Every structure is written in C-alpha cells, then in structure tokens.
Design a protein around this ligand. Structure first.
Ligand SMILES: OC[C@H]1O[C@@](CO)(O[C@H]2O[C@H](CO)[C@@H](O)[C@H](O)[C@H]2O[C@H]2O[C@H](CO)[C@@H](O)[C@H](O)[C@H]2O)[C@@H](O)[C@@H]1O
Ligand SMILES: OC[C@H]1O[C@@](CO)(O[C@H]2O[C@H](CO)[C@@H](O)[C@H](O)[C@H]2O[C@H]2O[C@H](CO)[C@@H](O)[C@H](O)[C@H]2O)[C@@H](O)[C@@H]1O
Ligand SMILES: O=c1ccn([C@@H]2O[C@H](COP(=O)(O)OP(=O)(O)O)[C@@H](O)[C@H]2O)c(=O)[nH]1
Ligand SMILES: O=c1ccn([C@@H]2O[C@H](COP(=O)(O)OP(=O)(O)O)[C@@H](O)[C@H]2O)c(=O)[nH]1
Lengths: 343, 343
C-alpha cells in the first residue's frame, strides 16, 4: 500500500547467479515486498529478474561485463533517475552506500539507507556530516558510529527453502571455504586450519582485481589440487553442495564483518560454522550449538574436533528461526512505517 | 557582479605546487574573477591559495596523502556542499566531470560544466542522458560527442609572465619530456626519438599507481643516468628550467588529448614542441612556426633537424596571443552571461 523504490548496486544481477550479497538481499526483500501488495520499482541492472518494475541504466552486471570500464558512470545514472522521480515514491530504500547522501538532502521523499559495509576512516566523515538521516544497520557490532540516526537493526536473511539440507557430511571428511578470496575473509587461515587438523579443504569464490596480488602470493601456491581445492566462483547449486558436504565451514575473518551471508547459508545446509569472533559472527553463530566462536587459528583447529557433536538439523532450524525473509521484510516494513510517520 | 561557485577536483592543491592541470586552470580563473569584482566561492582542498571564498571538505591534496583511500567520499562531500547552497550563487562552474550532472537537474541555479577529459565508451552514456546541459569544451577536437549542448569552446590558458623566457637553449643540447609518465603521453616514443636523433633526453613527471607497471616495464629499464634522465615530478621553477633549456619538447601522444597544458608551457618558455598530431595538437601548435605536427616517430625525428630553425621568441608571443588568462576569463564571462540569459 506504499510506493517503494529499491536502489541496488550494479556490480551484480538482482539476484546474482553466483557471487553477490547485497543484490541477493535486495532481491529477496524486493520480491517479498511486491507480494505484500506494494508498488515496487527496482533500480538495478538490466538483466535482473524481478516481478516489480525494473528501471536499468545498463543491461548487464558490471563486474563480469567486459565492455564497461567506469562503474561510477552508471552508478551516477542510477541516482539521477531515482531522485528525479522522487515524488513517484513514498520512500526510497538505498543500498549503494554513502553515494546517496548528498542526494537525500535535495529531495523531499524520505530515504532509508541500509548499511551493508564497514565503517572506514574516510567514510565516517561523510556519514558524520549526514548523521540525521535514516540508516538501518544489519548487525549491532556494525554501529561503530553511534552519532548516526539508526532507525533499527534489521538482520539479513536467505531463502532457506531453496537450500538443500544435508543430514550427514561427505563420507571422506573435508572442510569448506566459501567467499571472495580476500584477506578480510582469511582463506589463508582456512588453509592453515585444514593442514594442521589433517582434513582437506575445498574452496570456492571469486578473485576480483583488488585481491589478485593477495591470491597470487598467499593463496595460490597452496592450492594442491588434492588437499587444497579451489573451484573459482560458485552458483547457488554449486555452493549448496560445497558447504553441505563439509563437516564444517571455516569462517576465519580478520576484519569487522558487517554480517556474513555465507554463515547462514552454511547453517541452512546443516553445516555449522567455525568462525573467529569478529564483527557480527557472535550475533550470527550460537556458540556450541550451530557453530563455535574462536579467537585464534588453534581455537578453530581445536573446535573442528568438536564439530561432529552438533545437531545438524538444529542448524537449519536456527536459520529458519532468526534469518528468514518473512521476519526481515516485516522489520523493513516497520522501518518504512516509522520513517513516513516520524518525519 | 555575479556570485560564482568554482568546483575543483580534490586530487591537487589549487594551485598545484607540482603536477596538476585542471587545478591550475581553476586558480587562474578564480583569482582573475575575483579581481573583476565577482563574489566567487572556491570549492577545493583546504591548503589551496585563493583570494575567493574557500570551502574545503579535506585539508590536503589527496593524490599524495597517505591517509586517504576513498577519494569518492570527499568528492561527494564537496558536491553535497555546493548544491545544498546552490541558491547562494548565480552560476555554478564545475570542473569535476560527469559526477555533477545528476545534481544539475535537481537544483535551480544553472550549472556550467567545463569538460577536462576524453570521451570514453562508458562516459558517453551519462553525457548523452544530460546533453541539454551547459557544457564548455577546451578544444574543438574534444567534441567527439556532437549531440551535446556546447555553449562555447574556451581554450585553456597559463600565466605566461610566471614562466621565465629562455633566449638560447642549454649549451650542450638536450630534449625535454614533461607530463605524467603514461602511455597516453608516449614517453617511450620520446626515448625512441632520443637515440635516433643522438640528442639526450631529460624527463620530468609523476608516476602514479596506474602507470607503475607501465613505468617498470617500458620506461625505467632505459634510464641510463646520462643519456636518459628522469627527475621524478617537478615543481614550477624546475619544469620551466627543463623546458627553457631544451631545444624542443617531445609531445608524442598516443591518445585523444583534450588540450595539453605542457604545450603552451613549453612555448611560453620559448621552446617549440615536436608533437604527434592527435587531439588538440593541431589547435595548440602552429605547424612550422612554434613547433611541428607529426604523424610517426620518423616524422618527429625529421622535425628535430628543423627545430634550431624556428624563432624561439615567436613561441612566447604566440601563447600571449591566444592562451592568456585575460582571453580565457572573458570568454568564460561571456559563457556565464549566455547561460543566465538563455535560461
Ligand atoms: O573497505 C573495504 C571495502 O571493500 C568493499 C567495497 O565496498 O568490497 C566491495 O568492493 C570490492 C571491490 O574491490 C569487492 O571485492 C567486494 O566483493 C565488494 O563487496 C560488496 O560489493 C558487492 C557488489 O555489490 C556485494 O555483492 C557485496 O555484498 C558487498 O559486500 C567493501 O566490502 C568494503 O567497504
Ligand atoms: O580517460 C582516461 C582517464 O584518465 C584520468 C582519470 O579520470 O586521468 C586522471 O587520473 C589519472 C589516474 O588514473 C591521473 O594519472 C591523471 O593525472 C588524471 O588526469 C586528470 O586528473 C588530474 C586531477 O584532477 C588533473 O590535474 C589532470 O589535469 C587531469 O588530466 C582522466 O584523465 C581520464 O578520465
Ligand atoms: O563463490 C561464491 C562466493 C560467494 N557467494 C555468495 O555471495 C554472498 C557473499 O556475501 P557475504 O556476506 O558472505 O560476503 P561479502 O558481502 O562481504 O563479500 C553470499 O550469498 C555468498 O553465498 C557465491 O555465491 N559464490
Ligand atoms: O612534473 C610535472 C609534471 C607535470 N606538471 C604539470 O601537470 C599539468 C598537466 O597538464 P596537461 O594538460 O599538459 O596533461 P594532463 O592534464 O592530461 O595530465 C601541466 O600543467 C604540467 O605543467 C608539472 O607541473 N610537473
């Protein structure tokens, strides 16, 4: 009973066939909002698949499109189209970060910003200047700047029904890594953990330009092909098989993780998570039940021996209980309600 | 008699102590507008030196500042500052490129955009969408998108008086290269010309992140220390001594050059330019008088024999005649009048 604009990043399709976190959350939120009878306009790439109105400034995902060199050009096209049409919307829900803040002061339609990223020494200064806007965080640990006007915390979610549940892991045990090959995700940690426990590690993910040196130096020399396997970038079925077959997923971050969608994807498949307790991991993992919070590699190494005891079905039930689209979209509805009323 | 906003890039100080083309043009334009009684607000780094109003979102030039990783944050900070105060100005003069186009449709004060860059396969798409805006080209050959509403072509200018004139080049002859060490400027070409003419080459310029590989592979292995010299980025006095002492400046571009300030800087010192006839070279160099338009390495080599034959003093007068601050600022004043009238 509202007109809602969803402004997504253009790096990935909505929803992404493989890598993509925000575009996934935007897809789930958008589709469910439309089902609830709202007039939704999706601002996303041209190959996106939505039942809402799709306005696109480029036909394809930009990350893997070979003809595009300047992503910022089409980002600016998107924001120009959105805020030029402000009075065609009751609320604008932006997922593109700080690039939308100077536009918000120039239009009358209220804008809601879901923060999907880490606060940095630089972006804090632009967020500071626009602190009295309606931000929504995806985890409590993310709120490192309290002077911002957080309307609410709305945890992310996945479509649990679409993830196949695995009752028992693969007959010869192996560990899984799923994520972009970045130091922030610590795949080098994951490689050390598997070698010291003696259990193989299967890796999947992208290696975009910023991590090529890191992959060339720390990761690639260790990809054995037998004990350390790497299947670059995985679509939904491939990733669902990878975590499901594993006894546990290594999530050894070295970085203030905003949320970590792979964790709830692992648990949804029934595979618990051995993670280091940084950022949102303590809020996502229930220690000793759906996984194990660790503070060191050895803590993670020791925890892998206590992984078989966990109830794998409890992991899936846990994801259903707190990380469902039903709850997320309802919480996002509460946000729109508040923003339109407390203006 | 107008209130004018000057929106500069933040990579370099206004004025730049060393490298910096666009930031230099903004200085001469800003100071001269103030002298003519305009209420000018300059948006640039906090260490800028202006007699106009200085609004800064970061205190220093960002290119060499080690604490900044996200330039787009402060660019957005600046663009937010300008258009939030749009009705404090009669005209906004933007030099930051396409990132300001979506703002122009959202504010009431008319905006004039000076194009300082090359049209790209990507950036063409955002300019097309905003073609009915007030663009100003710095050369006619730059107008690769004719469908834009060009108000006028306004060639750039330099402060000729600040460049010392050199009547006779250095006693043992040498060739000069001045520019960013980029393939677009073809410094490797200049080295091919050096050995074929038998005259040494003195090189000056920056090597920023994008051209470090280009530098290590194509340029650096050839730096003798005697025949090929590189003095890593030069401030104003050093670069003027570099050009003045040279018999000619090599400008072997490989790229649709928007203008090329080093060309009128070389001539200002009295040094003619051996350039490849791409982009703005035919409009900046008077062939056979202040330099030589060339079409290959061999065509440049042949021109070096005909360089001691040109009048060096005619070069300085040429820059005074067409590329003076007086002429540029008056033409930009005419542009301001037209934009305010044909609104
Ligand atoms: O401060 C580190 C900075 O890295 C970010 C930039 O916002 O990572 C994104 O950009 C890099 C490009 O180098 C990508 O490797 C990375 O996948 C990006 O992650 C974000 O952008 C994707 C595309 O939309 C989303 O799918 C993803 O959900 C999102 O995390 C940030 O992580 C961080 O701010
Ligand atoms: O189309 C090529 C693309 O290269 C640009 C990037 O926008 O070059 C600028 O940024 C590169 C680094 O990638 C620098 O080497 C270069 O100095 C830059 O040139 C422009 O930006 C400076 C800072 O404002 C100006 O001082 C300079 O005069 C200007 O040419 C662009 O040239 C272009 O878009
Ligand atoms: O090979 C991969 C690697 C990642 N993803 C997905 O892209 C999203 C990544 O989100 P996450 O929060 O876990 O990491 P980040 O956003 O910080 O890159 C998740 O849905 C992953 O399942 C994927 O499909 N394939
Ligand atoms: O060591 C250097 C190298 C370059 N420049 C200046 O950087 C500017 C570059 O302008 P130009 O148009 O010639 O090249 P571009 O803008 O495309 O980089 C010129 O004023 C140069 O004088 C400089 O001062 N010192």
């Amino acid at each position: 009973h509202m007109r809602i604009a969803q402004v997504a990043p253009l790096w990935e399709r909505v929803p992404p066939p493989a890598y993509g976190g925000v575009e996934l959350v935007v897809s789930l939120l958008t589709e469910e909002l439309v089902k609830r009878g709202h007039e939704v306009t999706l601002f996303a790439s041209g190959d996106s698949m939505t039942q809402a109105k799709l306005v696109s400034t480029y036909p394809h995902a930009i990350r893997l499109d070979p003809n595009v060199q300047e992503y910022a050009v089409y980002e600016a096209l998107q924001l120009g189209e959105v805020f030029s049409r402000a009075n065609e919307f009751d609320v604008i829900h932006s997922h593109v970060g700080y690039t939308a803040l100077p536009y918000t002061s120039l239009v009358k339609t209220p804008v809601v910003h879901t923060l999907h990223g880490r606060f940095t020494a630089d972006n804090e200064r632009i967020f500071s200047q626009y602190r009295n806007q309606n931000y929504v965080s995806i985890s409590h640990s993310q709120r490192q700047l309290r002077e911002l006007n957080y309307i609410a915390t709305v945890y992310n979610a996945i479509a649990v029904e679409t993830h196949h549940f695995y009752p028992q892991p693969s007959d010869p045990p192996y560990l899984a890594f799923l994520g972009r090959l970045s130091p922030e995700k610590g795949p080098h940690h994951a490689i050390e953990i598997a070698k010291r426990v003696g259990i193989p590690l299967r890796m999947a993910g992208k290696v975009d330009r910023v991590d090529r040196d890191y992959f060339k130096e720390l990761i690639e020399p260790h990809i054995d092909g037998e004990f350390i396997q790497f299947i670059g970038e995985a679509d939904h079925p491939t990733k669902n098989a990878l975590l499901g077959g594993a006894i546990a997923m290594l999530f050894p971050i070295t970085w203030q993780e905003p949320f970590g969608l792979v964790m709830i994807e692992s648990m949804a498949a029934g595979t618990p998570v051995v993670a280091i307790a940084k950022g949102a991991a303590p809020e996502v993992i229930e220690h000793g039940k759906t996984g194990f919070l660790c503070h060191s590699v050895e803590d993670c190494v020791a925890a892998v021996a206590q992984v078989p005891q966990l109830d794998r079905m409890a992991c899936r039930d846990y994801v259903w209980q707190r990380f469902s689209v039903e709850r997320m979209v309802s919480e996002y509805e509460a946000v729109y309600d508040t923003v339109l009323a407390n203006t």
